[PDB]
Amino acid sequence: QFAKPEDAVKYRQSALTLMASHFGRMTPVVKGQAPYDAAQIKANVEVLKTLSALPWAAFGPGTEGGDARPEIWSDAASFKQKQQAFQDNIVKLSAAADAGDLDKLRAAFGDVGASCKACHDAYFKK
Amino acid sequence: QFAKPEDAVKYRQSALTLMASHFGRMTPVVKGQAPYDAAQIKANVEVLKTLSALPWAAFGPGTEGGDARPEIWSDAASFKQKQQAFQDNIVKLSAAADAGDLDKLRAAFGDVGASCKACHDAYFKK
Numbered sequence: 001q002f003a004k005p006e007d008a009v010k011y012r013q014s015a016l017t018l019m020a021s022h023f024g025r026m027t028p029v030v031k032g033q034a035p036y037d038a039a040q041i042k043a044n045v046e047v048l049k050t051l052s053a054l055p056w057a058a059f060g061p062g063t064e065g066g067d068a069r070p071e072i073w074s075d076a077a078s079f080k081q082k083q084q085a086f087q088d089n090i091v092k093l094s095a096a097a098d099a100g101d102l103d104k105l106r107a108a109f110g111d112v113g114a115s116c117k118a119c120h121d122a123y124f125k126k
Numbered sequence: 127q128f129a130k131p132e133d134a135v136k137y138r139q140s141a142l143t144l145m146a147s148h149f150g151r152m153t154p155v156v157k158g159q160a161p162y163d164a165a166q167i168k169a170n171v172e173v174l175k176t177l178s179a180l181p182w183a184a185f186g187p188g189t190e191g192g193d194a195r196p197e198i199w200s201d202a203a204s205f206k207q208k209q210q211a212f213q214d215n216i217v218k219l220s221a222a223a224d225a226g227d228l229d230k231l232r233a234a235f236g237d238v239g240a241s242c243k244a245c246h247d248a249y250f251k252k
């Protein structure tokens with residue numbers, strides 16, 4: 001769906017921005033600094049689930065740019081493992097949210113965050 | 127979820143960018159320039175439905191900025207009508223996609239586009 005590499009870069013940056021917001025906005029809830037409304041969090045994690053599937057199709061071959069490291073494309077299998085592992089960490093978070101289980105939510109939230117960082121430490125130009 | 131108005135601006139711009147892509151990428155299909163795969167389009171319109179609900183919460187009071195016109199906030203009811211009408215045009219598109227009905231899809235796609243433009247002509251700083 002992208003005319004030029006720049007269009008793929010713009011798309012993935014936007015998708016990732018929307019993930020950071022839907023993930024990060026739960027931080028006060030996980031910490032207990034804001035109240036826990038199970039239905040609110042269930043709905044928000046559903047949005048996050050949708051968003052979390054979107055960036056990866058915008059790293060198609062030849063779409064070097066932005067703050068993406070070139071290693072994304074020299075080993076397609078390893079990058080795919082990292083996004084698939086991240087999306088399975090999101091599945092654990094979805095399950096916790098759907099169950100209304102705050103303890104599971106806290107644990108899953110931490111593991112999701114670790115998975116974001118794991119990808120960045122290999123594939124983001126700091 | 128926004129620390130400063132700038133964060134709401136960044137969010138809505140990103141959400142709107144992701145809408146433009148999920149909407150616009152269907153243009154060749156509606157025109158017959160690309161093939162029609164009902165299942166593909168159903169799945170894409172579902173993503174668009176999710177995205178199409180997201181921008182409006184990032185125009186909360188005091189979030190002037192970006193290319194948003196101030197009239198968004200001087201008549202909350204009229205802006206709300208426009209986003210709600212746009213989201214109901216998306217419902218027609220969803221129904222067409224879910225039915226696998228290309229003729230309905232073309233008609234709905236046109237009406238969705240008109241609804242985007244209707245909002246821009248009142249509320250976007252050209």
Ligand code: HEC
Nearest residue numbers: 013016017019020023065066067068082083086116119123
């Ligand atoms: C690899 C499998 C990643 C996972 C998992 C996550 N992110 Fe990431 N992120 C990745 C790359 C390669 C890039 C650079 C994209 C580019 O072309 O510039 C990023 C970037 C971001 C950004 C900045 C977006 C922007 O405005 O330019 C943010 C805010 C971000 N990433 C957040 C984020 C979060 C919160 C994640 C887990 C919930 C996450 N990312 C996972 C690669 C990958």
Ligand code: HEC
Nearest residue numbers: 139142143145146149191192193194208209212242245249
């Ligand atoms: C009002 C109810 C709107 C409807 C319906 C749509 N859009 Fe719009 N759009 C609107 C505003 C007020 C703004 C400015 C936001 C800001 O703070 O700058 C926009 C902006 C866009 C953009 C640019 C985003 C960016 O990168 O900065 C795009 C690509 C865009 N809008 C696309 C778009 C499409 C395709 C729509 C229908 C499918 C649509 N918008 C509807 C207000 C409203």
